[PDB]
């Protein structure tokens, strides 16, 4: 997806390989980039949110809740991911669409919320638009927008009982929140180079990742609950090889890039998820920043 | 479609059972297999000589002889010239195609290809690409095609069994194992054999949950979480980790155990994989 | 009259011309086999010319098959680092026109043709294997011999290949029976409403494209309609006169 | 000349011609293909019915390297969902009017090099599907009488029809697809055991027993035999039964012959010659005997 | 005769030198293939595994599929007397056909589609093609079939002759 | 045009833009075929030795399903045996066949997606394609003519129906399609239904020795060539 | 493959001739090619020829279960897949910008014109509805397919006859032609397409029926669909060089005249065919 030169990649890998990871941004490994977001961006949508990164990418999510004829729980919710310029069937788009759905349907509590009555259920439509061209891996931003959107989602209050077809007050200000203030799941693209664990990686950083995980978490530091982990195929594997100065290389030559040839060391996987779930960690930082957005 | 003999205009209904007696349904399946023992893997190599390398994998549904469940046919196609629309790639391009057999399709007539088929491709692609040496064969591509001949549970029936995701993890574990068998058969430079292990945290009683290797959701009253792992025992590396389930961060130990047993399942599966490959040559 | 033959109907050796001095020069529509049998490949009428010990099947068809030394009105499609690709026929594989295939052409003095530029060129090379090559020079002399890019104001009109051959044969009106050009030029007397003849220059590709140019739009349209309508109509020479009489009234 | 392996890859047709023509120098040599199989020798069938657990019927048919897995899954089609439906008197018939048989062939990607994902798609899958479909109906293999689902209160009505989705997947393709594919279809249909279904007026839907099953009354046993002509072009021509993938690439002319011998008299249910003119009336008349022999041997496999 | 699995340990890099079918990892040498181990034992002993790609300098046999006045595009079939399970396109540029008078030689006079050429790989090429040179006595057309479809024989280095039709044809004969 | 007329009716150059074309109608079936002379083959089918022949069949109504894909293969294989494909190594030959009319089966409601082989239409398609190829002047080894025989059985006798309507085909005990080359060789032999080899051979005779399609092809082609070579004199 | 282009000599001349008010066909700028409309022996077959442009169109009705866009509604569809017969440039199963617009303009014309009584089509609600499919076959493409196709489509649909049907005791009986005489498809008003083309660099030259060669030279076009009574069913000047609104109003004003004679022809031609059916 992303394109970089081997010599450019070799510098990035070496810099992040140092004991204190010297990220190209100068950012701390625990530190996210600045976040700009909006809620209720689209009127007439039960929940909507916009998010734009310092990277320039932006995404908009809108939530439509429609009463449908069915404590009861079924995967009524459907997620759509509109990426500009894709064939509507690409690997990345469908993988993301399933991944975000996996997070919400992971506990199944979320399905329960959308249960108007035993006879009728709220079929929830989540439409995710990547406003910007896919300059970098959208997953982090899309997840944060979905988190913000669901938080902003309000559900029509039910004047009618359940056995009769449901009837709802019409005031959006009367309608109570979905996920009223468990939280909607956040998901962090976590990356590893050597023993260093990196969060919110830039496309340049992610291009040299030895390991990349999409970790979905929620809260009820905060009382975190792990929901899913998926291994993002390190884009580093698809990069060109480095050419040493004047066949199988016997030695890891300094400054010569070489795609990570194996899998993730077993311990690193524990380290990547351990650091995600540590109390007061990145998840708390993300939720603190996210929950500070007006709703 | 133009390319297939369309069935009847009306939407056909899958058979719905009479369900005459509730009593007849009686007891719920209980896992007799020890918590640390995988299903009996049947693995064969060279099943499609036309391909550069191939393998076939089949599992007993509930460790019962003759009761076959998952069935996977894999045909690695050997490094071959890349299409000329994208005629160059510095690294060998691993391409994974996974398709449920029409017999195994969720719908006998389907408007849309299962998202599940695309998803399994990405997981398997990530798992195998880690285990395959791309540097060896620049300017070339290798295509791993998995045909999911049969699922461990009928697709339309799986909808009733809590969640298809658990079945998908079982399917992915098989895909990793069979694909590795095919890759070894095809003589594709691989860092290590990769086998697909899967493990689950389950709670079939009011007592504390157990960690169970190679689960099937029907055998358990509640799967709290599960993990699928493409693992390289000679490297002690994981090329594709997949986990799902609500686990409190306080239960980080359980997750760690869940992954470890999932890796243990991968080692167990790899045992069959090496045995099949050893006897193949 | 000439015998009509369907494909595969082996020519009887009695009909076959035999000349000890010259090997039989088979033309279009005939195929030789080692057994020394001559088999027609297309439906048509067998033609024999004992003066040349030559024999071929006469037939009419649209899609032109490039043949060496033919004169064709190719249209440039693109320019490569050294040659201009030209499409002799609309879906035929593009021919190659070397950049220096024009009279007095050099890397400095080469004519700068453009995509879609019409060019009248000879088929330099043609094989069943390789794509055809074009030329505007006569390589033995370097002169254009009337070939080269078509610069004048005009238009191109498609015609059947058989009709194109009728125009290109020297005795076009007497043998080819195509008097339309003479009638419109005023060379055929007693046409009526002659108007002293129109003024135009026409170049006829073996590929069935005939470029006709004139400063007068009406002239180009009229001659274009005349050639196309006499071709599609298979009109007799008197039918041609009736045609141009009708056209020249519409031209008014 | 070249090492035999190299000679097989480049100039395959001369290489086969050499095997198919016993060399003049050796009396001992006999006509034989690159497979070692004789021109008049077909590949041995292997049939493993019940291969797919979910399918109402199934067969895994192996013919040399070619490997077809056929799965027959029956689904119920309510008459209220059938345009053109009429209560039978007890048109093209129910099978064709309602499309109760839905065969589809999957030349599974990678089953052979020509079906690689990057290679352009070919119509072979469609042609086989219709070849099976028409042969499936013309042979009258399955009777709509079996697929009807009745109410019969205690005013009889047909409430739905069983729809047989006869899906085939070529796990391995080594040429001669139709013979294997048709054998799998027949083998699977013979194995098909649909659940006994009935109309539930209280639920107003068709319901099926969890244990009782009714087997299809497949009538006859049409067995497909195929061959291809290899030409030295004295225009010597060799008839190759069960053409291997490689042999199909070299033999432009192919013949397919579907015969049924359950009456003890060969009955030709279908013929499909194409691609050449070697197969005149004489060879086709001769081939009917070859197909009958193929029927006899296959009959012993599809017990 | 020792069978090795993918990822099986072969030994430390200090004892062996990685050969085909092997890969290094943390100063240790492993087998990347399922196959038998072999040690060259020539510096350190090279170790390899045997269960293929064209390479510069290799002699390949290929089939001509299309010819252009500039280059003839061939399909590579055999590399070093080894048939290739998958095929690669190669280009024989007009410069690369003949050892001398490279300006005078023409593709049409050298090879035509369908015949089999034995060529030497000159370079891994841009895009999808290799670049092969037949400009050597041992290189050129091996099997040729006339326009009439008969299998020809090399009458002289310049041309092939037909045994049935008798006609000659100009092609780049391989001298042996 | 209609089924009752014994005489085949054909035209050539029906479609002007096409390289060659022909509109042929017989026994109630009308098909219009356009042939494009060797042209640029899409790299997919650029065979190194011979021209690729690409037959395309379009039904009168509905989208071309699997049925047509079979007809295209049937005609593609046969015509590739007729055309001198060796003469245009890398070129392509388009043969688009458009079924303009077939006898409407009054006893069945319209079904467009039907996937069964329709032997009924094979002869009309083959003849029109043959005429179009002759019109296009594509070099060929020989002409070819196709005929359809339906072996209906009535009472105790078997009845041969020549060029039957599709209604007759479905009522027929068996149906046969023979395509004989001008050399009297057999080119296609597609057949279906239960029949003994004796019955097939009997039908082979009926289709081969009989409207004289060989004459019809020659006569119509003679008229076309005589018309456009009238100038020759 | 990509469409073949005229030589810049042809492009310049055609533009030059139009500036003179002359066309290579000898027709005026506001004149159509000779229109020939032929009806096939089978009901619903119509064969329109605009000079060298021929468009065969066949209507068909099959009772089908209603789902998706018309779950209980009864649905009329148009299929106009172009084929190499149209031109080698076109490829099977490969829609093109020409085909997509052609289909889009036809379906909008027939549907938005309200010509068909969709309520009449549904035999049963949510179970069985008549589906009226009209297949358009462009036998020869010499420009103005959108116009030739529209006449063929409406001619076919007006010529087409449904199988008769009857509801008895709630039982839907659909009668084959042998059982009952097919009933003509009800048809309120007939829309007709007119496709102007604009050539001047400012779009100041408007041509009524473009030859294929002209269509390659034109800088814009504007399809207009109208009833005989002047109701415009659609207008589609989908971009291209802009044209002064006065010109478009002139184009529509002229188009109504051409539509009236098209309507008269189809009515006359249907009457002529009707007498062949019932002398």
Curated annotation (Swiss-Prot), chain B:
Q: Which keywords accompany this UniProt record?
A: Cytoplasm, Exosome, Nucleus, RNA-binding, rRNA processing
Of the GO CC terms on this record, one is:
nucleolus
Under InterPro entries, the record lists: ExoRNase_PH_dom1, ExoRNase_PH_dom2_sf, PNPase/RNase_PH_dom_sf, Ribosomal_Su5_D2-typ_SF, RNase_PH
Location within or outside the cell: Cytoplasm; Nucleus, Nucleolus
Q: Name one GO biological process term.
A: rRNA processing
Q: Which domain of life is it from?
A: Eukaryota
Q: Which Pfam families match?
A: RNase_PH (PF01138)
Molecular function as annotated in GO: RNA binding
- What family does this chain come from, according to its entry? Belongs to the RNase PH family.
Summarize subunit and interaction data from the UniProt record for this chain: Component of the RNA exosome complex.
Function description: Non-catalytic component of the RNA exosome complex which has 3'->5' exoribonuclease activity and participates in a multitude of cellular RNA processing and degradation events.
Protein name as annotated: Exosome complex component MTR3
């Amino acid at each position: 997806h992303v394109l970089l030169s081997p010599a450019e990649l070799a510098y990035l890998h070496a810099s992040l390989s140092l004991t204190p990871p010297i990220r190209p941004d100068g950012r701390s490994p625990t530190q996210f980039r600045p976040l700009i977001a909006e809620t209720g961006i689209l009127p007439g949508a039960n929940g909507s949110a916009r998010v734009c990164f310092a990277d320039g990418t932006e995404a908009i999510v809108g939530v439509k809740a429609e009463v449908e004829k069915t404590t009861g729980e079924a995967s009524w919710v459907e997620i759509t991911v509109e990426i500009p310029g894709v064939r509507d069937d690409d690997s990345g788009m469908v993988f993301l669409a399933q991944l975000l759905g996996e997070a919400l349907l992971a506990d199944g509590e979320f399905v329960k919320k959308l249960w108007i009555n035993r006879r009728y259920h709220w079929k929830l439509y989540i439409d995710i638009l990547l406003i910007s061209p896919p300059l970098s891996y959208p997953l982090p931003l899309l997840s944060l927008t979905t988190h913000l959107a669901l938080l902003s989602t309000r559900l029509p209050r039910l004047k009618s009982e359940g056995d009769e077809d449901p009837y709802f007050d019409d005031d959006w200000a009367v309608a109570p929140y979905l996920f009223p203030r468990t939280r909607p799941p956040i998901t962090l693209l976590v990356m590893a180079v050597g023993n260093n664990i990196l969060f919110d990686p830039s496309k340049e950083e992610l291009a040299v990742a030895d390991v990349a995980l999409a970790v979905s978490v929620t809260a009820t530091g905060r009382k975190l609950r792990l929901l899913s982990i998926r291994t993002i195929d390190p884009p580093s594997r698809l990069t060109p090889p480095g050419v040493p100065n004047s066949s199988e290389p016997i030695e890891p030559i300094e400054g010569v890039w070489r795609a990570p040839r194996g899998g993730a060391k077993r311990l690193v996987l524990g380290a990547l998820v351990q650091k995600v779930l540590e109390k007061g960690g990145v998840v708390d930082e993300v939720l603190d920043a996210l929950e500070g957005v007006e709703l | 479609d133009r390319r297939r003999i369309n069935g009847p205009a009306g939407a056909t209904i899958p058979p719905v059972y009479e369900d005459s007696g509730i009593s007849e349904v009686k007891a719920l399946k209980i896992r007799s297999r020890p918590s640390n023992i995988i299903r009996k893997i049947y693995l064969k190599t060279g099943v499609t000589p036309s391909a550069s390398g191939s393998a076939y994998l089949e599992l007993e549904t509930s460790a019962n002889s003759g009761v076959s469940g998952l069935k996977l046919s894999c045909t690695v196609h050997g490094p071959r010239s890349l299409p000329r629309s994208s005629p160059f790639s510095p690294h060998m391009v691993v391409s994974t195609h996974v398709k449920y057999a029409p017999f195994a399709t969720k719908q006998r007539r389907g408007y849309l290809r299962d998202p599940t088929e695309r998803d399994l491709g990405i997981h398997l692609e990530a798992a195998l690409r880690g285990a395959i040496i791309a540097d060896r064969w620049p300017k070339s591509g290798v295509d791993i095609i998995i045909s999911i001949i049969e699922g461990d549970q009928d697709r339309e029936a799986s909808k009733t069994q809590g969640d298809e995701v658990w079945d998908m993890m079982n399917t992915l574990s098989g895909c990793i194992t069979v694909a590795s068998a095919a890759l070894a058969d095809a003589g594709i430079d691989c860092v290590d054999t990769v086998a697909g292990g899967v493990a689950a945290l389950v709670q079939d009683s009011d007592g504390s949950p157990e960690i169970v290797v190679d689960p099937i959701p029907s055998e358990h009253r509640k799967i709290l979480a599960a993990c699928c792992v493409a693992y390289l025992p000679m490297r002690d590396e994981v090329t594709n980790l997949w986990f799902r389930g609500d686990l409190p961060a306080s239960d980080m130990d359980l997750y760690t155990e869940l992954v470890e047993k999932g890796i243990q399942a991968s080692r167990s599966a790899n045992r069959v994989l090496v045995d099949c490959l050893t006897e193949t040559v | 009259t000439r015998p009509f033959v369907l494909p595969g109907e082996t020519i009887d050796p009695s009909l076959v011309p035999t000349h000890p001095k010259h090997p039989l020069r088979l033309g279009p529509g005939l195929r030789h086999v080692p057994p020394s049998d001559i088999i027609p490949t297309v439906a048509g009428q067998l033609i024999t010319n004992l003066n040349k010990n030559s024999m071929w099947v006469e037939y009419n068809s649209q899609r032109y098959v490039p043949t060496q030394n033919d004169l064709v009105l190719a249209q440039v499609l693109r320019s490569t680092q050294d040659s201009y690709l030209c499409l002799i026929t609309p879906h035929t594989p593009p021919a190659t026109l070397p950049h220096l295939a024009f009279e007095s052409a050099t890397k400095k003095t080469r004519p700068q043709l453009q995509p879609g530029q019409l060019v009248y060129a000879r088929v330099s090379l043609a094989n069943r294997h390789m794509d055809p090559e074009l030329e505007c020079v006569n390589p033995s002399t370097g002169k254009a011999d009337g070939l080269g890019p078509i610069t004048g104001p005009g238009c191109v009109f498609e015609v059947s290949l058989g009709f194109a051959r009728r125009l290109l044969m020297a005795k076009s009106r007497e043998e080819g029976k195509v008097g339309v050009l003479e009638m419109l030029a005023g060379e055929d007397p007693s046409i009526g409403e002659a108007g002293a003849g129109l003024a135009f220059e026409t170049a006829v590709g073996r590929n069935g494209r005939v470029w006709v140019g004139s400063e007068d739009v009406k002239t180009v349209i009229i001659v274009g309609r005349a050639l196309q309508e006499t071709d599609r109509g298979n009109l007799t020479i008197e039918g041609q006169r009736k045609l141009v009489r009708r056209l020249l009234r519409e031209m008014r | 000349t070249f090492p035999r392996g190299i000679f097989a890859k480049l100039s395959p047709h001369p290489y086969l011609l050499r095997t198919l023509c016993p060399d003049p120098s050796n009396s001992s040599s006999t006509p034989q293909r690159t497979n070692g199989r004789r021109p008049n020798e077909a590949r041995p069938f292997r049939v493993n019915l019940g291969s797919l657990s979910h399918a109402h019927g199934s067969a895994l048919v192996r013919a040399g390297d070619t490997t077809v897995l056929c799965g027959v899954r029956g689904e119920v089609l309510p008459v209220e969902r059938i345009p053109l439906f009429r209560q039978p008197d007890v048109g093209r018939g129910e099978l064709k009017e309602y499309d109760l048989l839905v065969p589809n062939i999957e030349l599974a990607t990678g089953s052979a090099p020509q079906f690689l994902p990057g290679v352009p798609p070919t119509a072979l899958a469609q042609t086989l599907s219709t070849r099976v479909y028409s042969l499936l109906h013309s042979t009258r293999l399955v009777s709509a009488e079996e697929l009807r689902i009745w109410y019969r209160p205690v005013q009889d009505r047909v409430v739905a029809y069983w729809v047989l989705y006869i899906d085939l997947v070529f796990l391995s393709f080594d040429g001669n697809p139709f013979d294997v594919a048709w054998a799998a279809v027949v083998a699977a249909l013979r194995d098909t055991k649909l659940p006994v279904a009935r109309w539930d007026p209280d639920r107003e839907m068709v319901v099926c027993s969890k244990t009782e099953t009714m087997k299809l009354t497949i009538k006859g046993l049409p067995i497909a035999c195929s061959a291809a002509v290899f030409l030295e072009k004295k225009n010597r021509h060799w008839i190759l039964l069960d053409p291997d993938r490689l042999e199909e690439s070299l033999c432009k002319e192919v013949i397919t012959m579907v015969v049924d011998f359950s009456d003890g008299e060969t009955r030709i249910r279908a013929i499909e010659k194409q691609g050449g003119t070697v197969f005149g009336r004489e060879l086709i008349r001769s081939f009917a005997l070859v197909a009958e022999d193929r029927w006899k041997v296959v009959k012993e496999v599809m017990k | 005769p020792t069978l090795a699995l993918p990822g099986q340990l072969l030994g430390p890099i200090s004892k062996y030198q990685p050969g085909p079918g092997t890969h290094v990892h943390e100063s240790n040498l492993y087998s990347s293939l399922l196959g038998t181990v072999h040690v060259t034992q020539p510096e350190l002993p090279t170790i390899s595994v045997s269960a293929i790609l064209p390479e510069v300098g290799n002699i390949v046999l290929c089939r001509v599929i299309r010819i252009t006045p500039r280059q003839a595009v061939v399909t590579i079939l055999v590399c070093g007397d080894t048939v290739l399970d998958a095929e690669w396109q190669g280009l024989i540029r007009v410069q690369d056909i003949r050892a001398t008078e490279k300006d005078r030689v023409k593709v049409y006079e050298s090879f035509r589609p369908g015949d089999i050429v034995r060529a030497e790989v000159i370079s891994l090429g841009d895009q999808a093609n290799y670049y092969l040179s037949t400009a050597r006595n041992e290189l050129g057309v091996i099997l040729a079939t006339s326009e009439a479809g008969n299998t020809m024989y090399p009458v002289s280095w310049r041309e092939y002759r037909d045994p049935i039709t008798g006609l000659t044809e100009l092609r780049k004969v391989a001298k042996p | 045009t209609t089924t009752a007329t014994t005489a085949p009716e054909a035209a050539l150059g029906v479609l002007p833009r096409a390289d060659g074309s022909a509109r042929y109608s017989h026994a109630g079936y009308t098909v219009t075929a356009s042939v494009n002379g060797p042209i640029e083959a899409q790299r997919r089918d650029e065979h190194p030795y011979e021209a690729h022949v690409d037959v395309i069949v379009r039904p009168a109504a509905g989208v071309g399903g699997t049925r047509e894909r079979h007809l295209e293969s049937i005609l593609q294989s046969s015509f590739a045996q007729i055309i001198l494909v060796k003469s245009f190594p890398r070129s392509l030959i388009q043969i688009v066949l458009q079924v303009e009319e077939s006898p409407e089966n009054e006893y069945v409601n319209t079904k467009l997606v039907q996937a069964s082989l329709n032997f009924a239409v094979m002869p009309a398609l083959f003849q029109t394609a043959m005429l179009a190829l002759l019109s296009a002047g594509v070099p060929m080894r020989a002409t070819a003519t196709a005929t359809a025989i339906a072996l209906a059985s009535e009472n105790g006798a078997t009845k041969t129906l020549i060029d039957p309507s599709p209604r007759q085909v479905e009522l027929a005990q068996s149906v046969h399609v023979f395509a004989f080359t001008s050399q009297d060789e057999l080119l296609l032999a597609e057949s279906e239904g239960d029949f003994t080899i004796k019955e097939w051979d009997a039908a082979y005779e009926t289709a081969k020795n009989i409207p004289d399609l060989r004459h019809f092809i020659r006569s119509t082609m003679e008229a076309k060539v005589a018309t456009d070579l009238h100038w020759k004199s | 493959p990509r469409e073949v282009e005229p030589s810049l000599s042809e492009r310049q001349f055609v533009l030059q001739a139009l500036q003179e008010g002359l066309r290579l066909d000898g027709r005026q700028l506001d004149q159509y090619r000779p229109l020939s409309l032929t009806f096939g022996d089978q009901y619903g077959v119509a064969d329109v020829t605009f000079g060298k442009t021929r468009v065969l169109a066949k209507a068909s009705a099959e009772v089908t279960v209603p789902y998706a866009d018309r779950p209980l509604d009864g649905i009329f569809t148009i299929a106009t897949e172009l084929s190499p017969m149209t031109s080698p440039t076109f490829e099977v199963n490969r829609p093109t910008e020409t085909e997509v617009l052609l289909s889009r303009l036809l379906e909008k014309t027939i549907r938005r014109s309200g010509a068909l009584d969709t309520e009449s089509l549904c035999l049963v609600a949510g179970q069985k509805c008549w589906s009226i499919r009209v297949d358009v076959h462009v036998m020869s493409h010499d420009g103005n397919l959108v116009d030739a196709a529209c006449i063929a489509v409406v001619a076919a649909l007006r010529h087409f006859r449904k199988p008769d049907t009857s509801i008895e005791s709630g039982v839907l009986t659909i009668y084959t032609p042998a059982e009952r005489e097919p009933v003509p498809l009800s048809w309120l008003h007939t829309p007709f397409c007119v496709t102007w083309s604009f050539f001047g660099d400012e779009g100041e030259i408007a041509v009524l029926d473009a030859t294929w060669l002209e269509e390659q030279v034109r800088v814009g076009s504007c399809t207009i669909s109208m009833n005989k009574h002047g109701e415009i069913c659609q207008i589609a000047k989908l971009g291209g060089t802009p044209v002064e609104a006065v010109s478009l109003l002139q184009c529509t004003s002229i188009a109504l005249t051409k539509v009236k004679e098209f309507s008269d022809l189809v009515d006359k031609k249907l009457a002529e065919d009707f007498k062949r059916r019932n002398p």
